[PDB]
Amino acid sequence: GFKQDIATLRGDLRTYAQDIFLAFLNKYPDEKRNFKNYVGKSDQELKSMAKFGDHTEKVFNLMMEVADRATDCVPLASDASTLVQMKQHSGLTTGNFEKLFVALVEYMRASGQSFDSQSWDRFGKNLVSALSSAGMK
Ligand code: HEM
Numbered sequence: 001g002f003k004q005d006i007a008t009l010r011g012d013l014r015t016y017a018q019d020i021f022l023a024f025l026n027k028y029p030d031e032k033r034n035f036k037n038y039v040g041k042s043d044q045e046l047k048s049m050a051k052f053g054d055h056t057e058k059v060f061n062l063m064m065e066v067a068d069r070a071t072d073c074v075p076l077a078s079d080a081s082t083l084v085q086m087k088q089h090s091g092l093t094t095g096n097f098e099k100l101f102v103a104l105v106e107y108m109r110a111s112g113q114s115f116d117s118q119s120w121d122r123f124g125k126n127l128v129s130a131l132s133s134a135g136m137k
């Protein structure tokens, strides 16, 4: 289930972080509005850009922590507040997060693998709720 999936993702985190983010950017190309430096690049080109590798991994490092601290796919209020309050998220709305988790669930649903895609969909919904409750528009 969900806890095992966190262990699976962590076991190959660089590869999952990159592949899931690329799945997001390719499903929702207008999301590059927030990622102007990733425009006009193939997947292989992006995976050779230092900040793409570094930042993607740091994002999924924290995403796996927030998942791990959750109870029944419901994140901590402190983790939602950190996500709303981060200088780097000043732009964003809950729709940006909903799209990331739609892409993550579809990636899991297409993978060869026994991911608990249902639990990740709930986690994305519940994180969106926590973000809205903690002040994200
Ligand atoms: C649970 C989901 C997410 C987590 C854990 C998270 C975490 C992070 C972290 C740790 C950073 C700092 C990266 C660094 O500077 O090395 C970051 C930066 C950023 N995040 Fe998020 N993030 C999440 C979702 C999103 C979403 C959905 C978007 C936009 C659609 C987004 C946009 C950004 C941007 C634009 C930056 C800074 C610019 C950049 O690093 O390229 N984040 N995020």
Ligand SMILES: Oc1ccc(Cc2ccc(O)cc2)cc1
Pocket: 020, 021, 022, 024, 051, 052, 053, 054, 055, 056, 059, 100
């Ligand atoms: O180089 C970066 C890549 C992504 C982000 C935020 C983020 C958003 C969605 C995602 O699936 C992974 C990361 C920040 C910096």
